[PDB]
């Protein structure tokens with residue numbers, strides 16, 4: 001990866017302009033651990049991350065780099081470089097022109113709704129990236145639709161490997177609570193927890209609803225699994241109304257994958273290879 005001096009990056013981001021790209025600045029969004037800025041290096045668009053002590057933020061910055069060097073795939077975000085300025089820490093990525101799946105499902109900034117067809121392809125691409133990580137003995141630990149980015153062709157790219165671990169218990173439980181498996185919430189580190197998170201993501205893809213909404217019933221999207229199983233509601237009642245091309249058969253087939261992924265018992269969940277196989281059969 002390219003080593004940037006902090007000055008190189010400050011200049012390409014209009015002095016790290018915290019104003020949104022809609023107003024004229026360079027801010028595109030925010031993550032865990034930093035604001036993301038639009039940068040331009042040699043007429044190529046790049047994404048820049050400017051990053052709880054100084055010695056603790058270093059091992060979390062080194063993580064994204066450690067994992068991103070070992071893991072390169074068509075469905076993983078590509079790291080282009082970094083900036084080692086001691087205190088100031090920056091990560092540079094290939095800019096995803098279509099941002100996150102989260103933003104594209106909510107139609108943020110007026111983007112049109114994703115079709116069922118586009119959704120199915122994104123689900124498959126997201127599963128392929130998780131499969132590559134699991135084959136390379138890595139647990140993502142933060143699978144969610146804000147961590148699924150879309151390129152120039154809406155190819156799904158898993159991102160954010162700051163919490164990714166190699167191959168177990170931990171005292172420091174980290175992740176996104178509305179996507180987390182009961183055992184991950186208990187401290188277990190397992191690739192099976194990632195499958196569960198992916199199941200929440202498949203429900204987001206079918207429903208177009210966020211994983212958690214305080215002004216909703218039920219507030220957690222994974223709870224709809226119980227409403228359907230308890231025949232209080234149907235999957236037809238929950239399909240995203242912002243589509244014109246969804247068919248009952250493939251919608252039921254993706255719901256069945258999500259339902260299996262969301263089993264409360266980690267060992268009763270399918271592995272990613274089975275998830276990939278099942279999503280492939282949905283479009284065959």
Ligand SMILES: CN1CCC(n2cc(Nc3nc(OC4(C)CC4)c4nc(C(=O)N(C)C)ccc4n3)cn2)CC1
Pocket residue numbers: 028029030031036047048049077093094095096097098099100108109111149159160
């Ligand atoms: C209406 N238009 C307006 C433009 C918009 N747009 C394009 C982007 N590009 C984009 N965004 C990223 O992060 C976001 C989603 C939080 C901003 C991002 N993150 C990483 C990454 O891996 N990180 C940091 C860990 C890598 C590449 C990235 N590329 C954002 N918004 C699409 C819709």
